[PDB]
Amino acid sequence: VPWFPRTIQELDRFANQILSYGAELDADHPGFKDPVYRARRKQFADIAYNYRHGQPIPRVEYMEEEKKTWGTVFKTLKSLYKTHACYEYNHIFPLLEKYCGFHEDNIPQLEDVSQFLQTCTGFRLRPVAGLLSSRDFLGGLAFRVFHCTQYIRHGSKPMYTPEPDICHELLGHVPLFSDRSFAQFSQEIGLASLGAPDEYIEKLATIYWFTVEFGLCKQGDSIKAYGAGLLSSFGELQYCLSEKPKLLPLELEKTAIQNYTVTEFQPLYYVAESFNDAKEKVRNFAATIPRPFSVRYDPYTQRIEVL
Ligand SMILES: C[C@H](O)[C@H](O)C1=Nc2c(nc(N)[nH]c2=O)NC1
Numbered sequence: 001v002p003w004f005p006r007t008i009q010e011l012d013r014f015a016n017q018i019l020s021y022g023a024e025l026d027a028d029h030p031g032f033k034d035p036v037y038r039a040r041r042k043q044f045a046d047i048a049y050n051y052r053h054g055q056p057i058p059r060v061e062y063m064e065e066e067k068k069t070w071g072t073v074f075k076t077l078k079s080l081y082k083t084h085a086c087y088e089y090n091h092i093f094p095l096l097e098k099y100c101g102f103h104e105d106n107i108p109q110l111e112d113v114s115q116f117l118q119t120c121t122g123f124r125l126r127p128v129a130g131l132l133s134s135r136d137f138l139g140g141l142a143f144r145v146f147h148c149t150q151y152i153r154h155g156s157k158p159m160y161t162p163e164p165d166i167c168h169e170l171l172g173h174v175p176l177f178s179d180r181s182f183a184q185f186s187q188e189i190g191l192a193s194l195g196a197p198d199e200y201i202e203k204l205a206t207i208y209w210f211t212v213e214f215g216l217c218k219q220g221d222s223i224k225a226y227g228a229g230l231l232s233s234f235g236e237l238q239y240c241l242s243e244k245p246k247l248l249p250l251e252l253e254k255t256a257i258q259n260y261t262v263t264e265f266q267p268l269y270y271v272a273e274s275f276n277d278a279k280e281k282v283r284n285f286a287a288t289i290p291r292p293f294s295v296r297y298d299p300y301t302q303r304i305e306v307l
């Protein structure tokens with residue numbers, strides 16, 4: 001059985017296991033030829049590297065150029081939310097603007113966003129350097145911990161990022177983690193991953209892809225976006241609710257093995273009935289994963305109980 005954290009503090013073992021040679025080092029990355037950007041990214045990476053569970057997340061003074069990039073992303077995406085985003089998203093967005101500084105001229109600090117999430121559903125953020133393995137990333141969800149990037153995409157291409165960046169974390173993920181039902185759903189994915197065989201970790205990562213990242217959900221007689229990948233992509237958010245893509249009901253035995261690529265708009269999306277239902281489906285799917293035990297998270301002591 002693969003090792004897995006049993007206490008929320010044990011998530012600290014993660015920072016010592018990310019891909020050390022990240023996307024920003026690639027020749028085609030938007031900021032590759034910019035040495036200031038490179039040092040700026042290493043600076044955020046260092047903050048994540050020295051972070052330890054329990055500490056407040058360091059505040060960072062963003063530069064005028066970074067604030068501009070965020071402003072561009074914020075304003076163009078905001079125009080789509082009232083009509084394309086699920087109810088849960090629009091319900092919390094005003095509070096985020098009011099209490100977390102979500103505005104075109106201000107990049108929210110992760111500590112404030114984390115405290116806000118903790119008050120809503122007990123979810124918290126932890127700054128992360130680069131890409132964690134799926135096992136470690138999903139594992140954190142079992143503790144209602146979301147590993148979040150703090151850096152921003154290069155200013156030369158505000159509408160493009162080959163990786164998650166702070167605009168994607170805050171405008172895409174954070175609002176759904178504010179909802180109790182979604183929080184419980186995400187956590188169920190994380191619980192399923194604890195000690196699971198690598199082959200199932202990949203199946204759960206695919207389920208995660210088709211829900212948390214690119215999920216569509218029923219809302220009364222309508223359909224809305226809730227996946228963070230869609231909610232932070234201006235082009236795909238509009239495309240996903242048009243007649244072009246194919247839509248199928250969320251069905252984990254099929255979803256878990258569906259192939260996808262991360263470079264074009266998704267040709268197929270899965271539609272959840274609701275977060276409680278997706279949660280139930282994950283729970284059932286998790287029972288099929290060969291694990292010599294069951295797991296339960298105890299929020300009172302922040303430890304995972306193994307049986
Ligand atoms: C999205 C994919 O299916 C999978 O769950 C992962 N997501 C992420 C990851 N690592 C980071 N840093 N951020 C993510 O959003 N590793 C694996």
Ligand SMILES: [Fe+3]
Pocket residue numbers: 164168173213228229
């Ligand atoms: Fe994401």
